[PDB]
């Protein structure tokens, strides 16, 4: 079996991606936030507090005929951003892109925190990690992707976002025409549940590539690039006028600047993000200060190759029984 969905940027600063994915019969169609950094498939639900609930679409487990309790189980996650869920559980019928998992455990949120509230545009999150990391208990649940596996024709997903635009996440195959050029793999760690890979180096716009290993996980859930702030201060040193600022929560630039590029290595290739991805607008509504894309992770604990890089590639999730990441320019 395969599956293609399309993914849609929730606003103009591609803060986010939702994915439309069919729960239950008879279907209830929700937009959910894949995850490549999680491993809970969450939605606002019935049971959702209703103060918690403005403008989300919810899943009802009563309407569907499929819906089973999971008797006793109950999740709750916390996300890097400070966010957190939390509920009780169902087994239900999911399907993305026309692939159907059977008695896929869907979370059922009873609790969300005030940034989940706060977009509309997110029903919940598909979480696409390792299933090591799932929050059920007292019997952890498989992801999406590991209770499809068996059933794909490759036990693989790509992650094809855009910039301003939509993109494609694919299930159990790897299209050809979606990229440029060869994919290079490279090795993942599960040990922390994350796709986590080392880069091999990078360069800020038309320098020297710096070869260095960086240790990250790739992160389709997280906004923006973090990394190490020897790596975030040699890249804002060529932008005039660009600070880190304490009072806005990391590295802000002049609006009227124009930013160079930022490569890392994946192996012996190199994927290149454009300046104009690393531009994510005025820190508040009409300010001349703008956020910049690229961040220090000294205040994480991991690096977080998030929507920033991935976007500039063809990025395939290969779980087969040694996990590995491949990465195309497109």
């Given at each position: 079996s395969t599956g293609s969905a399309t993914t849609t940027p929730i606003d103009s600063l591609d803060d986010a991606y939702i994915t439309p994915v069919q729960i239950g019969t008879p279907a209830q169609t929700l937009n959910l936030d894949f995850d490549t950094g999680s491993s809970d498939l969450w939605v606002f639900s019935s049971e959702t507090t209703a103060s918690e609930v403005d403008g989300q679409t919810i899943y009802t487990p009563s309407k569907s005929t499929t819906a089973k309790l999971l008797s006793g189980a109950t999740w709750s996650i916390s996300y890097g951003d400070g966010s957190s869920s939390s509920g009780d559980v169902y087994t239900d019928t999911v399907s993305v892109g026309g692939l159907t998992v059977t008695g896929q455990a869907v979370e059922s949120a009873k609790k969300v925190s005030s940034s989940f509230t706060e977009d509309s545009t997110i029903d919940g999150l598909l979480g696409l990690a390792f299933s090591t990391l799932n929050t059920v208990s007292p019997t952890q649940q498989k992801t999406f992707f590991d209770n499809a596996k068996a059933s794909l024709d490759s036990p693989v997903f790509t992650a094809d976002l855009g910039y301003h635009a939509p993109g494609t996440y694919n299930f159990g195959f790897i299209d050809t025409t979606a990229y440029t050029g060869s994919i290079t793999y490279t090795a993942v760690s599960t040990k922390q549940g994350?796709?986590?890979?080392?880069?091999?180096?990078?360069?800020?716009?038309?320098?020297?590539?710096?070869?260095?290993?960086?240790?990250?996980?790739?992160?389709?859930?997280?906004?923006?690039?973090?990394?190490?702030?020897?790596?975030?201060?040699?890249?804002?040193?060529?932008?005039?006028?660009?600070?880190?600022?304490?009072?806005?929560?990391?590295?802000?630039?002049?609006?009227?600047?124009?930013?160079?590029?930022?490569?890392?290595?994946?192996?012996?290739?190199?994927?290149?993000?454009?300046?104009?991805?690393?531009?994510?607008?005025?820190?508040?509504?009409?300010?001349?200060?703008?956020?910049?894309?690229?961040?220090?992770?000294?205040?994480?604990?991991?690096?977080?190759?998030?929507?920033?890089?991935?976007?500039?590639?063809?990025?395939?999730?290969?779980?087969?029984?040694?996990?590995?990441?491949?990465?195309?320019?497109?």
């Open positions: 994350f796709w986590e890979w080392t880069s091999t180096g990078y360069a800020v716009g038309s320098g020297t590539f710096k070869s260095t290993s960086i240790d990250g996980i790739a992160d389709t859930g997280t906004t923006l690039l973090y990394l190490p702030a020897t790596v975030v201060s040699a890249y804002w040193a060529q932008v005039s006028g660009a600070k880190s600022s304490s009072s806005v929560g990391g590295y802000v630039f002049p609006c009227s600047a124009t930013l160079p590029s930022f490569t890392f290595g994946v192996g012996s290739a190199r994927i290149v993000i454009p300046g104009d991805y690393i531009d994510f607008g005025p820190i508040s509504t009409g300010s001349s200060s703008c956020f910049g894309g690229i961040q220090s992770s000294a205040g994480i604990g991991i690096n977080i190759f998030g929507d920033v890089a991935l976007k500039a590639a063809f990025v395939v999730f290969n779980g087969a029984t040694t996990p590995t990441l491949g990465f195309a320019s497109k």
